[PDB]
Design a protein around this nucleic acid. Sequence first.
DNA 1: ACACACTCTCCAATTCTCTAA
DNA 2: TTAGAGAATTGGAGAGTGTGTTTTTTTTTTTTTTT
Lengths: 347, 613, 656
Amino acid sequence: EIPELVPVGEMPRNLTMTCDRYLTNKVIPGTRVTIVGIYSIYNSGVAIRTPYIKILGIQSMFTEEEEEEFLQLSRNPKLYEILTNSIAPSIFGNEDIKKAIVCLLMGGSKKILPDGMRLRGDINVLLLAKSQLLKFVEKVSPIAVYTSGKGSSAAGLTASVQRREFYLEGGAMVLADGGVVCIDEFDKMRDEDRVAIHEAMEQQTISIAKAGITTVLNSRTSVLAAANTTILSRFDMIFIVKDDHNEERDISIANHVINIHTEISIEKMKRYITYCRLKCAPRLSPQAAEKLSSNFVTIRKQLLINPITIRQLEAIIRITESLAKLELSPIAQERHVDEAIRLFQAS
Amino acid sequence: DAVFGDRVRRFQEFLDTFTSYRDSVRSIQVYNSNNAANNILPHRIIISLDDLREFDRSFWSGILVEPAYFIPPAEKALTDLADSMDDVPHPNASAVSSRHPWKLSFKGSFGAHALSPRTLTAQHLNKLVSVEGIVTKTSLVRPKLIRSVHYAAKTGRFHYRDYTDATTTLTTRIPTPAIYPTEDTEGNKLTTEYGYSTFIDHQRITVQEMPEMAPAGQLPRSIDVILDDDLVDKTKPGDRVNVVGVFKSLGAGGMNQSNSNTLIGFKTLILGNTVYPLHAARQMLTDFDIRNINKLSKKKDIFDILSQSLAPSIYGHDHIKKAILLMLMGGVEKNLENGSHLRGDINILMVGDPSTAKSQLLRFVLNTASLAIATTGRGSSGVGLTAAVTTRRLEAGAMVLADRGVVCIDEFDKMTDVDRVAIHEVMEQQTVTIAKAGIHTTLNARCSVIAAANPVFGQYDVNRDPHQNIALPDSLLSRFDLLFVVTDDINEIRDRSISEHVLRTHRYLPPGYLEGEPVPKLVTIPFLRKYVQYAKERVIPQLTQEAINVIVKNYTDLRNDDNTKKSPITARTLETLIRLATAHAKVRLSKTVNKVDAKVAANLLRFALLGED
Amino acid sequence: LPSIQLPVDYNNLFNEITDFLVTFKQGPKYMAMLQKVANRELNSVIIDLDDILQYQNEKFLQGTQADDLVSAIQQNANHFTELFCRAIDNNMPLPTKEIDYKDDVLDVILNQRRLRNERMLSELFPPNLTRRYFLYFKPLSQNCAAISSKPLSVRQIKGDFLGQLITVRGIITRVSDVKPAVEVIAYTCDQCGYEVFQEVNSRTFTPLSECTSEECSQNQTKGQLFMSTRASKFSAFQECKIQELSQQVPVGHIPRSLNIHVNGTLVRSLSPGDIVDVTGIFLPAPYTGFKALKAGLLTETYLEAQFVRQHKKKFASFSLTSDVEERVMELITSGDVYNRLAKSIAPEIYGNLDVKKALLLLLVGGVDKRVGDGMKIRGDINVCLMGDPGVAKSQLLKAICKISPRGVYTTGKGSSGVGLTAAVMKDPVTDEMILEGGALVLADNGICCIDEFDKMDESDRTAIHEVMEQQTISISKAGINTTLNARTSILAAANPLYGRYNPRLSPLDNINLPAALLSRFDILFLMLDIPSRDDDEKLAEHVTYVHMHNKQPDLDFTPVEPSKMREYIAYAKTKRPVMSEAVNDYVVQAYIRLRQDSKREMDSKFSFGQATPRTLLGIIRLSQALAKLRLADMVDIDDVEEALRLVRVSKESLYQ
DNA sequence: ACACACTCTCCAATTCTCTAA
DNA sequence: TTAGAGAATTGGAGAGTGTGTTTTTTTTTTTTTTT
Ligand SMILES: Nc1ncnc2c1ncn2[C@@H]1O[C@H](COP(=O)(O)OP(=O)(O)NP(=O)(O)O)[C@@H](O)[C@H]1O
Ligand SMILES: Nc1ncnc2c1ncn2[C@@H]1O[C@H](COP(=O)(O)OP(=O)(O)NP(=O)(O)O)[C@@H](O)[C@H]1O
Ligand SMILES: [Mg+2]
Ligand SMILES: [Mg+2]
Ligand SMILES: [Zn+2]
C-alpha cells in the first residue's frame, strides 16, 4: 500500500498477484503502479482461504540539437573559467580548488599496450566550508557515492569477511566502481582500510584470501577526500581550504534561509561532462613530451644540488590530458602542459 | 509408424554422401579394437549442422524444431553404419547384449536458438537450444538401471527386460516400476545375472547467467541440466560453459489432484547433448609452431631475445627479467626410489624503494603464466593462504589452488609474523598438513613463489646492515633462490632516459582507432607462451660432468670466502645453482646441461647475492 | 518376456569345477581342506584363481580344449559362489575323527523330523541350513597376469563394473561393531507339533503366521506358528567405509567413498586409518515393497569383501617362519648390523651418522616395566633435533616416516592441541556428544613426527605433557569422562631462538624450552652449520652425483632395502633383555657423576640445566635398545658405554 | 502393489419334526 | 422304541471391495576474523 496512506504507528499491508503472457516482465521492484484486476481467493482455522489478484492491466544518448550546444560551448575562448565559476558558486575564493575539481570530473585517458600492461585514467584529490564541496561534487557527477570514514557496515571503505559459514561484502570502494566516490572525513578511516586503500588506489582492485574465500574485486574509481603522514603520496593533488569572513555573504545566506523557511546549470553541466567523456580521449604532442621530460630532469637536478618520481610524472600527464579534454582537442599542447605544472603546486 | 523408416533411410544417404563421418566411425573402432588385445574412446560423433542444411533443408529444420521425432532415427542409422563395418569376432557374454548404440552431438550456426538462462522462455519448449553461463552446483554421480538379464534354472533359457524413465528418452512412454522379476511365465524360479545387465551413469548440474550480464542488482536466474554416460564429471563449480541440448518439461504440474489450485507451474530441464568450455589456460600447437620454435632455438643469444621481450614497457632491470624467465621454465623435479623427494621450483624475492616498478613488474607474470594466483600480503591469513576447516570438510587456500603454477604476493612486508610461518612448509616440502578437531590430512602445493616488499626504513639504507634493512628471519630468506635489492638512485642521464621512455610509451595508439578516439627484434607474447609451453613439456635436460665441475668449485668458494654478502649461504644454495643451470639448458632446448649453462647460472647468482658484476 | 542366446553354458563350467576340486595339486590340494571341514577343524575355504589358471594351462598342454573359467568367474562372480558350494556339498568326504555329534541342535531336530517322516510313510529343508563353512575367491597374481589384479582408486569405479570382481585401494574412514544377521529362520506349530523353515535374502521380511503343512491342513488343524532362536541360523555382519587417498584427489574436487560389507570369518579385519588393498564383488542394493514403486531407476551400491591385503606389516603381526629366518640369518652371518642398519637410513643424505644411529634406537625402543604393586614405567624413547636452517632436519624426519609401519607426520603451525590429542565433537544432527581421537591416538604403538616444534603455541604444547610420560589421555568434558590409550613415541624438530644459533648466549637461552618439557626427551641433538672448504666440497660432490644418477654414490657400502630392514627390526622387538648386577653397579656410579657435574656448572656457559632422575632411566632405555639390536637376552656393559657415548656426542657441536 | 480392515454372499452342516414298523 | 425322511436355521469360507504408505531460542566445544 502507498506510503502516504498508512495509518500512523502501523507497518504497511500488502497483497500477492499473478499475470501471464504479455503482462509478464513489465515492471521492476520499487516502482509505483496502478492495477486493474479480478479480486479472488485460493486454497493454501476452519472454512478459510487466502486472497489474491488476477491482473488485467498495468500503468506506471543525445540528440543533434543537444550536441550543437555542447560544441558551441567547446569553442568558447573562456570555457575553463566558465566551468570553474559554475562550481559551488556560493563558496568564496578557492580558485585552484575549483580548477582541481574540474580536472577530477573530466579525468585523463585510459590506455592498453601490446605487452598487456594497463595505464590508469582516473584522478585523485585531497582537501585539508569543505563539507559543501563534496555534496556539490555528488550532485554534478554522472555517478556518485558519499560516505563518512567509518563506512556503512563492517565492510568499512574497502571490504571485509564476516560470519555459521563465512561470507564477504564490499564497502564504498567496490560499490562506486565506474564512478566517483567522496569521503567526508578521511582521518576516521578504520585500521583495515588504512592498509587496503593502497591496493584500491594503485591497482584499482581489492584482493582477499581469508577463511577459504579467494577472490579479487574491481575498484575502478576517482576518489575525492577531506580531512582536518605517508598516505598523502597516494593522491595526485592535495590542497588546503581557505576562508573569508565578509558579513554581506553571511547576511545573504541568512536571507536565503529565511526565504526558503517563509555560468552553467547543474543538469546541463552534467550532460556536457558525460558527452565529453564519451566523445574524446586526447594524446600528447611531441612538443609536450620534450617540455615535460626537460622539466622533470630540471626539478630532479635542482633537488640534487640542494622527491619527484615517475609516479608523479605519470600524474602530471593525466592532468594535462584532462585539460585538453574540455576543448575536445584530439591532441594536447604546451598550453595545457603549462597550466598542468602551474596547477601542480600542491605543497 | 512408417515415417520412422524413411527418416532412417534419408539419414543413411547423408552419412554416405558426407564421407568424413565414416572415417570417424572407423578410426574409433580400429583404435578401440587395437588396445583391447593388450583408455577406450567413447561411441560418440559430432556432426556439423551446416552440412546437414546443405544436404537436406527438410531434415535440418526437422532436427532443429522437432528433435523428439528426428534425433532418434538419425542416431539409429549411425549405429547401423558402425555395426555393418567389420568388428572383432566371438564377443563375450556382456558384449553380446550391451544395449549400447552410438550417439550424436552438434556444432555450428544455431541462429535464433542461441540463448542464455535469463531469456529461455516457454515458447522454446521441445526445441533444440544452446545456452551459456556458469556452473554453480553438481550432484554426485549415480548408476541407473536400463536393462536386466535373468537365467531360468530348469529350462536353461536366458531372459531379459528393459526399463524407462522420463529423463532417459526423448519420446514419452509408460513408466516402469523398477522391480526385478522373480518367477517365469511358466512358473520357473529366476536368477538375476549382474555383469550381463546394463547400468549407466547419471549426474545433474545447474547453470546460471554470468554476473557481468545481471541487470539492476536483480536476482540472477538459472537452469538445471541432465548429463549421462560419457558427459559425466567433465565440469566443476565456477566453470564457464556452453551447453547444447533439448529443452523439455516434466511431471503432472499439480493437475494430479493437489491443494495448490494448480497455480504452480510445470517443471523443466535441458537434456545435455553436448558440452563445450569457454576460455574466459592452454594452447595447442600447429606444425608450423614446432618448426618456428626449433629454428629460433639455434640463434646465438636466444636468452637475451626472450628475456628482453618480457615486459618491454618497463625500462631497465635486465637481470630480474632473466630471473623471471628462468623461473617460468623451472628445474626438474626428482623422486628417488626410496620415496624421497627433491625440489624443482624456483622462488624469487625483490625488495626496494618506492615507485621502482616492483608492483608493475610483478603484475606482468600474472598475465603470461598458464596458471597464476595473486594476493596482497595483508589481505590474506595463514589459513586462508594454505587451508581451512569447514562444515568435517577441509577447504583449500591460495597456495593449494595454484598447484603446478605461480603465486604472486604483493606488500609482503605487511604480512604478520603469525601468517608468515604457515608458509615455511609449502616452499620446501611442497605440501600442506592439518591436524585439527576431527581432521588429519595432507595436501599438495607444488608452486613457485614470487613476491615484493618495502625495506624497514622506507628506503634502503646502505649505511646499515642488510639484516637491519630487511626484517625477516634467516630461515625464511634461505628459502628464496634469488633475492634482489633495487633503488631509485638520482642521476641526470638515467632520469632523462626513463622519462623519455615513459613518454614514448604514453603516445601509443591501438591499430583500429583514429587519433583522439576512446579505446634488435622482440618475439610476441602469444608466441613466447607457446615457446615456454613446448620447452616445459618436451625437453628434460640431464646433468653432465662438465657442468658439475663448475658447480662444485663455485659453491665451495662462495660459501668459504669472507665477504659482505646479503643472504645466508647454506646447503640450499647448491640446489639453486643446479636448478638455474637446468632451467637455462631448458631455454636452449638442449637434451643435456653443458658448461655454458653452469657458467651463466653462477654469473646470475653472483650478481644477485654479492651485488656486483 | 523375451530371451537371447549367450556363449556360456553353466553345465560345462560345473563339470570343470568338480574336476578341478578333486584333481588339482601343487593328495589333491582342496580335498585336504574339505577333510578339515568335515572334521569340524576349519571354517572357511579360500579359492586361488592362480590355481585355475595353472589348471587351464596344464589341461591345454595335454592337448585338450577347455573353457576359460578364470575370466568367466571374474565377469559374473556372484553366481559362482553357489556353483562351488553345490560342488563342495556333493563331493564332501566323510569325517576322519569322532565329533560328539549330539552337541548340534540341528542334527537332533532333523533326525527327529526324518523319523517322523519314516513313521508317517509306514526338498525337506533348504541346504543353506547345514553349510558349516564360508567360501571366498582370491584374485589373480599381477605377476602371472587382468582387471582384478590391477588396483582402482574410488573414482575409477564406474557403473560398468556392477557384478564383477575388482580390487580397490584407499583409506578406511569408519568401522561398525558386529551384529547378527538371519539366513534361515525356524518356527514351531503348537497344535500339530511340526516345524517349518523360511529363508531370508532381502534387507526385510514378513514372518510366517499360519501352518500351511498338508498334513496339518487335512486334519483341519489351524494351529499357530511361533519363532525359535535355538534352531535358526545366523551369520556375523559388519559394515565399513573406504575413501580415496588425499594425494590422488584432483584439484577443486571433494573426495569420494564406498560402502564395504563383511561376513563370516573375514569379520573385524579392517580398522580405521589403515591404508589397504581391498578386493571383492561390486553389486547394487535394490529397494523393497512400496518404496521400490516410487524410488525410480537410480540404484544404491556397495562392495562385498572377499580378501584384504595390507601395505605394511604391523609389528604385532610378526611370526618367525623359516622364510623370514633365512633372511635374518643373512644379516646375522654378515655381522656389524648396527652400523649397516644406521647407514641404510636415508642414504641420499651425507654424513650425520650419530643422528641416524640415535634414530635407529628410536625405532627399536626400550622394555616396558610393571611392578608388583601396580606402578608402571615408560618403555618408549623420545628424541628432538635442534639446529640451524638448511641441515636436512625436515628431510631426515620425513624419511623415518616411511620405515615405521604405524606413524603420522604433523607440523607445529597446522595443529591444534585438541586435534593433536583428542576432541569432544557435537558431530551428529541429533545434538549427541562424541569423542574422537587425535593424531597422538592414531599413532598409538607407533612414532609421531612433529616438525616446526618451535612455531607451535606455548599453551597448545602443554597438551603433549601427559602423553609423553604416562602414554595416556584423560578427558572430562560435557557428557564425556574417559581415559584413552596413547602408547606413542615422539620425534620433533626445531630451530633455535632467532633462527641461526647465537654463540653470544648460553645453550639454554638458545634452546628456549621449559624445564618440564626439556626433561621429557631422552635425547636432544644439537646440530650447527659451520662452513669448511674441505667438508663443503665433499658434500657438494655427493649431492651433485645424486642429482645426476638418482642413486647414492657407492664404492664399498650396499644399504639393506627397507623390507629386510623392517623384518630385522620386527624380529628384534621381541627380546626383553634383562640387566645384571655388574652392569647395575656401573650405571649407578655413572649417574652420581652426572648430577655432581651439573651442580658444579649451573652458572656456566656450558650449562644445559640439571640432571633429574629421568636421565637415569634414559640410560637404561638406550642400553636395552642396543641389547635388542644384537638379539641378546642380557644387557652388557658394552651396551652401557655406547649409550653414554651417544648421549655425550649430542653436545659436541658447541665446540666448533 | 502390497498388507490390512471390513462387507457381502452362498452353501452345507446341524438339529428339529413327523411318520411308520 | 428305533430310525429314517424332509424342513428350517445358522457359520463361516471365501470371495470381494476399498483403503494407506514414500519424503527463536538455550547450552557447550572449537575454529576463525575482528578490535
Ligand atoms: N621504467 C620504469 N621505472 C620505474 N617506474 C616506472 C617505469 N615505467 C613506468 N613506471 C611507473 O612507476 C609507477 C610505480 O610503479 P610500481 O610498480 O607501483 O612501483 P612500486 O615498486 O610498486 N612502488 P610501491 O607501490 O610504492 O612499492 C607506475 O605508475 C609505473 O607505470
Ligand atoms: N648432508 C646433506 N646431504 C644431502 N642434502 C643435504 C644435506 N644437508 C642439507 N641438505 C639439503 O638441504 C636441503 C634442505 O633440507 P631441509 O630438511 O628442508 O632443511 P631443514 O633442516 O628442515 N631446514 P629448516 O626447515 O629451514 O630448519 C635439502 O634439499 C637437502 O638435500
Ligand atoms: Mg607500486
Ligand atoms: Mg625443515
Ligand atoms: Zn501345524
